[PDB]
Design a protein around this ligand. Structure first.
Ligand code: ADP
Ligand code: MG
Length: 753
C-alpha cells in the first residue's frame, strides 16, 4: 500500500493514496494522518515493501522505478556504500571523505577474477569485468566515467587505473596523475580539484594480458584560466604548489613570492589548501595577506605543500631528471612574471602604449626565465608588424601578453602529457583498456567557447551512449527474437550537424571568420543565424527565459540534449585560434633556452576543428571496443559528507538518462554466447550421447543439469542470453579450463541417466 510521491527537496516521500481525482492522486504522508497533498498520477510510484533493506543491484528491486532507485542508493549511501549496480552499469555516489580500507591492496586482491555480483558493487569489479572481457573476447575495452563536476569521475578513473596496474602488471601509469593534475587541474566553485582538460587513458596489454605500457590523450585544456580567475577560483595547482612548496633556493632563482604578487593569480583566491600541520611547513614569505587573515582552504584530498612534495616524488619515480623538473618550473615562473608586465597609454590620441616603469623587473625576470631578449619581448608586446611596425593600444598589448602566456603554458602542458607517454611506452600491444574522464554537459549565467566545445563533445558522446545502450543492444534482442519491450530515443544528428558539418557547421563558419581580413565575433554570429534560419536547434539570445539584453550578433542559443544553452559569442574568434601571431611565435622559437625552443619545435590553427578531429579518433576507439559505464553522482553542492540531497540526485538520475533505461536494463540480457561456441568448447569432453545432440539441445541439457532456472536465461535464435544478476552463473558456463569442462560434462552425464 505505501507509495513514493513527490517532495520538493527529497525528490520523493512515502505516503498512502487516500483519493483519486481527474489527473491527480491525493497522498497522505506516512505517520501524519489527516494531512494531504496532490500529486499527478504519473508522479506516484510503488515502493518496496521493506523500506530498511538495500540491494546491491537495483535490478533486484521488486518495483524498479526512479523513486525506488533513489531510495535504494540513499539507504546504501547512509551506510557508506557508495557503489550500486544497475545490472553491469555502476552508480557511484561521491562520499566526500575517505571511506577506510575500500581501496586497499587487500580489497584490490579480493576483486581479482571475481564475477560481477559475487563481491559487493565496486569500481574494482567494473575494472575486473573489462579485463576479463578483454582477455576472453580478445577485444579492447573502454570504461566511461560520467557525471557532473565534482561527482567523482577523476577519482574513479584513478581507482580503475590503480586496480588494473596493481592487479595485472609485473607504478608509472598511476604516478603520472600528480603530474597531469598539477598542470591541468584547478580550484573552481564546483570542485577544488576540477579537471580543466579531458582525458582518455589507455592501459595496453600484450598477448598474455599483462600490462606493457600506457597512452594518455588530452583534450581542451582551459586557456582562459591561465590569466584570470573569479575570486573563489584558482589558476592551475602547479602555481600554488610551487609557491607553497619550492625550496628557498628555487624561490630565489625563479623570483617567486606570495601569490598576491602575480596578476595571473591575484584576481583569484590566493590561499593555499593546507591543514594545521602543512601550514607550518609553508614558509611565512609564501603566504598572501588573504591567507594570513582568512587562514587556509580546507579539503580532504588537496594540500598545496604536500602535493608539491608528492609531485616531485612522482617526477622522480616516472624517470624525470632534476634538470627537466627545474626546466618545467622555470617555464611556470616565466609565465607568472610575463603576467606582471603592465602597459600605459602613449600618443596624443592614446593610439599606442609603453611598458609601465614599474614593470621593469617583471620584464627582466620574464625574459631571463624564458631565454628572451628584454627589448625583443618589449617590442613584440607593444607593436605589431604589418604588410611597417605599428603601435598597439593598451588593450591590444594586454591581449598580446596574455596570448603569449596561454600559448607557452598550453605548449608546456602538451610537453608534460607527451613526457608521461614517454615514461610508459610500448612498441606493440594486443589490446587496451581505456578510461574516459571528460567534463559533462554544463551551463552558467555566461557561456563562452570552452562551454560550447564541452557541450559539443557531450552531444557526440550522448549519441554514442544511445547507439551502444539502446540501438545496438535492442537490435541484438530483436535479431535474436527475445521480445524485449523497445525503448526509443530521438537521435541528435541535427544538433551535431549544426555544430560540425563541413562548410555550414558552426565550427567551419567560425574558422571562415578567423581567415577573414578583419575578423569579427558579430560577423561570425550573424553568419551562423543567416545560414541556420530554419534550424530548430538554433535561436537568437532574445528567445531565452540576462539574455534579454544580448544582441542577435552577440550570441546564439543551442537546444542541446540536456537543455538550451545561450552562448555569448564575444572572444569566440580569439578562443578559436591556437596559433600565436608570427612576431610572438618568432620571439619564443628564437629563445636562448633549448627547452623553450623545444616546446615550439595569417597565423591560424582552429581549436574547434582540432578538437573535432581528436573527438572523432576517440569515438573510433569507443565504437570499436566493448564499453562499461560508471555514472558518478554528486550528492550535494557543498562538498560535504553524509548529505544526500534527494531532489539534486534524482535530477542527475533523470538527466543522465539512467531513469529512461531502467526497464530496458532490468528486462535485458547483458550476458550472451552462441549455442555453437558453447557446444564447440565442451565437444571434445563429451561422450557420444552428448555430442549427438544439436548445439541448442546440448546447451539445454547443460543448463537443466546445473539447476539453472528457466527465469535466469532465455534462448535466442542462435545465442543463449543471461539476465542481470546472473553473471556468476554465466561465467561458470563460459569457463574454459579442461578440469572445469570435464566436471560439468560429468554432471550432465549423471543428470541424463
Ligand atoms: N570515492 C571517493 N572517495 C573519496 N573522496 C572522493 C571520492 N570521489 C570523489 N571524492 C572527492 O570529491 C572530489 C571531487 O571528485 P572528482 O573526481 O575530482 O570529480 P569530477 O572529476 O567528476 O569533477 C575529490 O577531489 C575528492 O575530494
Ligand atoms: Mg575531474
Amino acid at each position: 500500500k505505501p507509495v513514493w510521491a513527490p517532495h520538493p527537496t527529497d525528490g520523493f516521500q512515502v505516503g498512502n493514496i487516500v483519493d483519486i481525482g481527474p489527473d491527480s492522486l491525493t497522498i497522505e504522508p506516512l505517520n501524519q494522518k489527516g494531512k494531504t497533498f496532490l500529486a499527478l498520477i504519473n508522479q506516484v510510484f510503488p515502493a518496496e515493501e521493506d523500506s530498511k533493506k538495500d540491494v546491491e543491484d537495483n535490478c533486484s528491486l521488486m518495483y524498479l522505478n526512479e523513486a525506488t532507485l533513489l531510495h535504494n542508493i540513499k539507504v546504501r549511501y547512509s551506510k557508506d556504500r557508495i557503489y550500486t549496480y544497475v545490472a553491469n552499469i555502476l552508480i557511484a555516489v561521491n562520499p566526500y571523505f575517505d571511506i577506510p580500507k575500500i581501496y586497499s591492496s587487500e580489497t584490490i586482491k579480493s576483486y581479482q577474477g571475481k564475477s560481477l555480483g559475487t563481491m559487493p558493487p565496486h569500481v574494482f569489479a567494473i575494472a575486473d569485468k573489462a579485463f576479463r572481457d578483454m582477455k576472453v573476447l580478445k577485444l579492447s575495452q573502454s570504461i566511461i566515467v560520467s557525471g557532473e563536476s565534482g561527482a567523482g569521475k577523476t577519482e574513479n578513473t584513478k581507482f580503475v587505473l590503480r586496480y588494473l596496474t596493481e592487479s595485472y602488471g609485473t607504478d608509472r601509469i598511476v604516478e603520472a596523475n600528480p603530474l597531469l593534475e598539477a598542470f591541468g587541474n584547478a580550484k573552481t566553485v564546483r570542485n577544488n580539484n576540477s579537471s580543466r582538460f579531458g582525458k582518455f587513458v589507455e592501459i595496453h596489454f600484450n598477448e598474455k594480458s599483462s600490462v606493457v605500457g600506457g597512452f594518455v590523450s588530452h583534450y581542451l585544456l582551459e586557456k582562459s584560466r591561465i590569466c584570470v580567475q573569479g575570486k573563489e577560483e584558482r589558476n592551475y595547482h602547479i602555481f600554488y604548489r610551487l609557491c607553497a612548496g619550492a625550496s628557498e633556493d628555487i624561490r630565489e632563482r625563479l623570483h617567486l613570492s606570495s601569490p598576491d604578487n602575480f596578476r595571473y593569480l591575484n584576481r583569484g583566491c590566493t590561499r593555499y589548501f593546507a591543514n594545521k600541520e602543512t601550514d607550518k611547513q609553508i614558509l611565512q614569505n609564501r603566504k598572501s595577506p588573504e591567507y594570513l587573515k582568512a587562514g587556509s582552504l580546507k579539503d580532504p584530498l588537496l594540500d598545496d605543500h604536500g602535493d608539491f612534495i608528492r609531485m616531485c616524488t612522482a617526477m622522480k619515480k616516472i624517470g624525470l631528471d632534476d634538470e627537466e623538473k627545474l626546466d618545467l618550473f622555470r617555464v611556470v615562473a616565466g609565465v607568472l612574471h610575463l603576467g606582471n608586465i603592465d602597459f600605459e597609454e602613449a600618443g596624443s590620441t592614446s593610439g599606442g602604449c609603453n611598458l609601465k616603469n614599474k614593470s621593469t623587473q617583471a620584464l627582466e625576470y620574464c625574459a631571463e626565465l624564458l631565454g628572451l631578449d628584454q627589448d625583443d619581448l618589449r617590442v613584440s608586446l607593444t607593436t605589431r608588424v604589418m604588410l611597417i611596425k605599428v603601435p598597439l593600444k593598451v588593450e591590444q598589448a594586454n591581449n598580446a601578453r596574455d596570448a603569449l602566456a596561454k600559448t607557452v603554458y598550453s605548449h608546456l602542458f602538451d610537453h608534460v602529457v607527451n613526457r608521461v607517454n614517454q615514461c610508459f611506452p610500448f612498441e606493440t600491444s594486443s589490446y587496451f583498456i581505456g578510461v574516459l574522464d571528460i567534463a559533462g554537459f554544463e551551463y552558467f549565467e555566461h557561456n563562452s567557447f570552452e562551454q560550447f566545445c564541452i557541450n559539443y563533445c557531450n552531444e557526440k558522446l550522448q549519441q554514442f551512449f544511445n547507439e551502444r545502450i539502446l540501438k545496438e543492444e535492442q537490435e541484438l534482442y530483436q535479431k535474436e527474437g527475445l521480445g524485449v519491450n523497445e525503448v526509443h530515443y530521438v537521435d541528435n544528428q541535427d544538433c551535431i550537424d549544426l555544430i560540425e558539418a563541413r562548410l555550414v557547421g558552426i565550427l567551419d563558419i567560425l574558422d571562415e571568420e578567423n581567415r577573414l581580413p578583419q575578423p569579427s565575433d558579430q560577423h561570425f554570429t550573424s553568419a551562423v543565424h543567416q545560414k541556420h534560419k530554419d534550424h530548430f536547434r538554433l535561436s537568437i539570445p532574445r528567445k531565452s527565459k540576462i539574455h534579454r539584453n544580448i544582441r542577435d550578433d552577440e550570441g546564439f542559443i543551442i537546444r542541446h540534449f540536456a537543455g538550451a544553452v545561450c552562448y555569448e559569442t564575444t572572444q569566440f574568434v580569439e578562443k578559436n585560434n591556437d596559433a600565436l601571431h608570427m612576431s610572438l611565435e618568432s620571439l619564443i622559437c628564437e629563445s636562448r633556452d633549448k627547452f623553450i625552443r623545444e616546446l615550439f619545435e595569417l597565423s591560424f590553427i582552429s581549436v574547434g576543428n582540432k578538437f573535432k578531429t581528436q573527438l572523432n579518433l576517440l569515438l573510433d576507439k569507443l565504437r570499436s571496443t566493448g564499453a562499461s559505464f560508471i555514472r558518478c553522482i554528486k550528492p550535494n553542492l557543498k562538498m560535504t559528507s553524509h548529505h544526500f540531497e534527494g531532489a539534486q540526485i534524482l535530477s542527475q538520475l533523470q538527466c543522465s538518462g539512467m531513469v529512461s533505461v531502467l526497464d530496458l536494463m532490468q528486462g535485458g540480457f547483458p550476458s550472451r554466447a552462441s549455442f555453437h561456441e558453447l557446444y564447440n568448447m565442451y565437444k571434445k569432453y563429451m561422450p557420444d550421447k552428448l555430442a549427438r545432440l544439436d548445439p541448442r539441445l546440448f546447451c539445454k541439457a547443460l543448463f537443466k543439469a546445473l539447476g539453472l532456472n528457466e527465469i535466469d536465461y532465455k534462448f535466442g535464435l542462435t545465442k543463449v542470453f543471461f539476465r542481470p544478476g546472473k553473471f556468476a552463473e554465466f561465467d561458470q558456463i563460459m569457463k574454459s579450463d579442461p578440469d572445469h569442462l570435464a566436471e560439468l560434462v560429468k554432471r550432465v552425464n549423471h543428470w541424463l541417466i
